[PDB]
Write a protein that binds this ligand. Sequence first.
Ligand code: HEM
Ligand SMILES: *[C@@H]1O[C@H](CO)[C@@H](O[C@@H]2O[C@H](CO)[C@@H](O)[C@H](O)[C@H]2NC(C)=O)[C@H](O)[C@H]1NC(C)=O
Ligand SMILES: *[C@@H]1O[C@H](CO)[C@@H](O)[C@H](O)[C@H]1NC(C)=O
Ligand SMILES: *[C@@H]1O[C@H](CO)[C@@H](O)[C@H](O)[C@H]1NC(C)=O
Ligand SMILES: *[C@@H]1O[C@H](CO)[C@@H](O)[C@H](O)[C@H]1NC(C)=O
Ligand SMILES: [Ca+2]
Length: 595
Amino acid sequence: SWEVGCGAPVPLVKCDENSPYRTITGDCNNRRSPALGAANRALARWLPAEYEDGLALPFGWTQRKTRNGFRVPLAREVSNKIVGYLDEEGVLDQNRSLLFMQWGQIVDHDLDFAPETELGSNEHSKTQCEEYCIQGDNCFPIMFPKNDPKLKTQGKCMPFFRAGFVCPTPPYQSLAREQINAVTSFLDASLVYGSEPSLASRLRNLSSPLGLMAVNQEAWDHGLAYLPFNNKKPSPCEFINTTARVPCFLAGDSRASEQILLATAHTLLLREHNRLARELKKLNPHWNGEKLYQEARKILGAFIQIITFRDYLPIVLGSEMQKWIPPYQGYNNSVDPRISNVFTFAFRFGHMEVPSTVSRLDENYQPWGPEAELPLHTLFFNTWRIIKDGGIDPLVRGLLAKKSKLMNQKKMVTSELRNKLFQPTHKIHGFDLAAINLQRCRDHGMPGYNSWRGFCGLSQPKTLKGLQTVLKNKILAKKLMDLYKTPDNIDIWIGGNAEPMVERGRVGPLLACLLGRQFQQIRDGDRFWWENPGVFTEKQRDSLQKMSFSRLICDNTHITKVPLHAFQANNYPHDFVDCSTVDKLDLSPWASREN
Ligand code: HEM
Ligand SMILES: *[C@@H]1O[C@H](CO)[C@@H](O[C@@H]2O[C@H](CO)[C@@H](O)[C@H](O)[C@H]2NC(C)=O)[C@H](O)[C@H]1NC(C)=O
Ligand SMILES: *[C@@H]1O[C@H](CO)[C@@H](O)[C@H](O)[C@H]1NC(C)=O
Ligand SMILES: *[C@@H]1O[C@H](CO)[C@@H](O)[C@H](O)[C@H]1NC(C)=O
Ligand SMILES: *[C@@H]1O[C@H](CO)[C@@H](O)[C@H](O)[C@H]1NC(C)=O
Ligand SMILES: [Ca+2]
């Protein structure tokens, strides 16, 4: 009997079996198991969770508890010795735009979010973790290795709180601890609309029956809309410049303001919505707010899906694309659509594609102002640079005309993220995304590198020399062996990202397999997948397949020169062309005459 009949949530809902629209929660997608791929349920386990005590405590928690007979190395030490680098010269991806990085993050945010356990409010224990670096309960601090410069300027640790888990909040116990996915597993634009009822209605333009999203009432971008602002005081976007006092945005997803390009992308998405909704009203004046909201939402859902599957995944997965994600063959209700706990680490390959600077560029795609280029760390939680420093258009052109960082075995994660990350409530630009990722693999009970190699039908190196051969890199294998002792102990995030990239792709074979399999399932196990006979008409679909990111820019900003292929590295003006040469979204097939 599954000791299923956990957990006390999620406020179970009931389905309208002939509803033509998705729920907000993702309930009801799968008819026979309606909670599948819904938000606020456990991330799926492709392999059993691996905890120090079998149930909940992470490897590394108890100093004298080994993993396979070896101590697991400090996350920050792995980070310092392997992940970091000094010289940003030469690190850029010659064939991927910055938008490639950015769309990766957007997709990730559509799919998964394992928020921290919520116990630190109404209490200092959260501030005591930071202050005293005392491991316990949900405080699992990232301690500095001796020799860390941060030890000299920053104290003993970086604070880190364990992720939320189902059943959920109070600690224990019986089966293994299962982390929660706070968003819908479907690729459904949940980051624009929200994955909870509360949030989803708050976001909409209810006053007006046009079914627009709520827009900003204090700022505009050459008349084009901005996201609404967020109420929650204290605001990290306020905190990073108290003079400017500009708060974070309010999106479907709580992380929308984390970095300025994410907030930028979110802005394009909310606008396409209204562009569609109003366009729909024009062509169907009879439809109330709802019908327009849902029809706009649904097209946008399709937009995310299409760009992701037609434009993005092929240039991540490369040669392995075919093998894991073959041409669509319809909805299959036996396929598990849930995001796996491992995927949420495999998709953090993006972290190695983030470059050290962001640019604002002008209509000639030239530096915009005298500080056109800024270090990435000054743009974390930064809304004021958008509203008071030229709106989104200069940033969007940066997205097209600048390049992603290329992953590099000797230059993995820029120090902007590896030393200068900001976390709300923690005041400093002093955190380490890489170390966090490693501690979080352990927090989540991740099987090690070789377990996952084995899952994917790949060899499992057991010696330094075997690891050299798999990684095609002597020195990197030697560093990982020195720290981890056995490849069986290499944390998945670093193991997966250390593999050389597959031909025509940007991740290695292990991640290709973890990624590919997840993406296959989110497409095949989705009853509302755009191409699934019945979701859209044949004519809508010849039209949906017209859509493009170049197009979404052209229709939602004052940029009129775009590339046809927005994810490749494009230089102005040679690889740019005017907006009128880029196919439009022909909405004719949405015309409804109910005469
Ligand atoms: C400036 C760029 C970025 C910043 C500042 C950023 C920051 C972060 C932070 C703070 C977390 C939470 C880490 C934790 O506590 O475990 C995170 C998680 C994550 N990052 Fe990023 N990241 C960026 C880019 C990207 C990109 C480009 C991708 C993918 C292509 C990505 C994928 C993810 C995923 C999947 C998670 C886990 C989400 C979840 O299930 O909770 N990130 N990132
Ligand atoms: C805080 O934001 C303020 C407000 O925009 C920034 O100051 C602006 O920057 C330059 C020179 O200081 C001027 O062109 C603006 O008009 C300034 N405005 C004001 C009111 O001073 C300031 O640089 C930001 N500070 C940080 C640390 O990010
Ligand atoms: C809702 O729509 C009306 C009419 O277009 C507009 O004036 C109003 O500002 C909108 N409200 C918000 C918060 O978006
Ligand atoms: C649905 O997926 C399951 C498990 O992967 C498989 O057994 C089944 O054949 C698939 N259905 C169709 C119609 O292909
Ligand atoms: C750049 O990548 C695209 C796919 O993004 C590919 O078709 C093209 O051949 C590549 N360009 C170069 C110059 O290698
Ligand atoms: Ca989603």
